PDB file of C-alpha atoms in Angstrom:
ATOM      1  CA  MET A   1      36.046 -79.116  39.746  1.00  0.00           C
ATOM      2  CA  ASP A   2      38.706 -77.671  38.456  1.00  0.00           C
ATOM      3  CA  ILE A   3      39.901 -80.624  35.709  1.00  0.00           C
ATOM      4  CA  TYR A   4      41.569 -79.720  32.174  1.00  0.00           C
ATOM      5  CA  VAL A   5      41.837 -82.208  29.277  1.00  0.00           C
ATOM      6  CA  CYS A   6      43.556 -81.783  25.515  1.00  0.00           C
ATOM      7  CA  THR A   7      40.529 -82.998  23.069  1.00  0.00           C
ATOM      8  CA  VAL A   8      43.326 -83.529  20.138  1.00  0.00           C
ATOM      9  CA  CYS A   9      44.658 -86.550  23.082  1.00  0.00           C
ATOM     10  CA  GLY A  10      43.629 -87.147  25.956  1.00  0.00           C
ATOM     11  CA  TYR A  11      45.321 -86.076  28.151  1.00  0.00           C
ATOM     12  CA  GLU A  12      43.569 -84.894  31.794  1.00  0.00           C
ATOM     13  CA  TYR A  13      46.103 -81.996  32.445  1.00  0.00           C
ATOM     14  CA  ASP A  14      44.906 -82.421  36.341  1.00  0.00           C
ATOM     15  CA  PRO A  15      46.231 -79.861  38.760  1.00  0.00           C
ATOM     16  CA  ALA A  16      46.924 -82.338  41.217  1.00  0.00           C
ATOM     17  CA  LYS A  17      48.752 -83.658  38.375  1.00  0.00           C
ATOM     18  CA  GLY A  18      50.626 -80.924  36.904  1.00  0.00           C
ATOM     19  CA  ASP A  19      53.420 -81.232  35.490  1.00  0.00           C
ATOM     20  CA  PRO A  20      57.462 -82.140  36.652  1.00  0.00           C
ATOM     21  CA  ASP A  21      58.776 -82.695  33.555  1.00  0.00           C
ATOM     22  CA  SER A  22      58.737 -78.280  32.861  1.00  0.00           C
ATOM     23  CA  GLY A  23      58.913 -76.164  36.847  1.00  0.00           C
ATOM     24  CA  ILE A  24      55.388 -77.540  37.929  1.00  0.00           C
ATOM     25  CA  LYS A  25      53.836 -78.092  41.277  1.00  0.00           C
ATOM     26  CA  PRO A  26      51.997 -80.915  42.557  1.00  0.00           C
ATOM     27  CA  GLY A  27      48.441 -78.615  42.707  1.00  0.00           C
ATOM     28  CA  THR A  28      48.869 -75.245  40.304  1.00  0.00           C
ATOM     29  CA  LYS A  29      46.199 -73.329  39.103  1.00  0.00           C
ATOM     30  CA  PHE A  30      46.007 -74.171  35.033  1.00  0.00           C
ATOM     31  CA  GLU A  31      45.458 -69.457  34.949  1.00  0.00           C
ATOM     32  CA  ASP A  32      48.403 -69.781  37.159  1.00  0.00           C
ATOM     33  CA  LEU A  33      50.738 -71.677  33.865  1.00  0.00           C
ATOM     34  CA  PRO A  34      53.372 -70.901  31.930  1.00  0.00           C
ATOM     35  CA  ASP A  35      52.674 -68.727  29.021  1.00  0.00           C
ATOM     36  CA  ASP A  36      54.768 -71.112  27.065  1.00  0.00           C
ATOM     37  CA  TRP A  37      52.330 -73.886  28.860  1.00  0.00           C
ATOM     38  CA  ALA A  38      51.497 -76.024  25.756  1.00  0.00           C
ATOM     39  CA  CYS A  39      49.878 -80.185  25.451  1.00  0.00           C
ATOM     40  CA  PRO A  40      52.895 -81.759  26.185  1.00  0.00           C
ATOM     41  CA  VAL A  41      51.211 -85.156  25.014  1.00  0.00           C
ATOM     42  CA  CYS A  42      50.532 -84.166  22.536  1.00  0.00           C
ATOM     43  CA  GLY A  43      51.363 -80.634  22.030  1.00  0.00           C
ATOM     44  CA  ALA A  44      48.407 -78.668  21.730  1.00  0.00           C
ATOM     45  CA  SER A  45      48.648 -75.705  22.956  1.00  0.00           C
ATOM     46  CA  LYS A  46      46.623 -74.598  26.255  1.00  0.00           C
ATOM     47  CA  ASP A  47      43.249 -73.665  23.660  1.00  0.00           C
ATOM     48  CA  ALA A  48      42.786 -77.303  22.899  1.00  0.00           C
ATOM     49  CA  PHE A  49      41.759 -77.742  27.004  1.00  0.00           C
ATOM     50  CA  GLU A  50      38.135 -77.975  27.445  1.00  0.00           C
ATOM     51  CA  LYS A  51      36.995 -78.301  31.915  1.00  0.00           C
ATOM     52  CA  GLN A  52      35.987 -81.928  31.248  1.00  0.00           C
TER      53      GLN A  52
END
């Protein structure tokens, strides 16, 4: 559908899950994400995630 999980740790971004600590609304495009967002889990940049 439009899910993205980190391959470093394994934290499904889930657009519906978005992010609470960072300033993200519930249901945000993974492309509209800030230009400084990074795997808030481990840290891995936004280039480690892979559509499901």
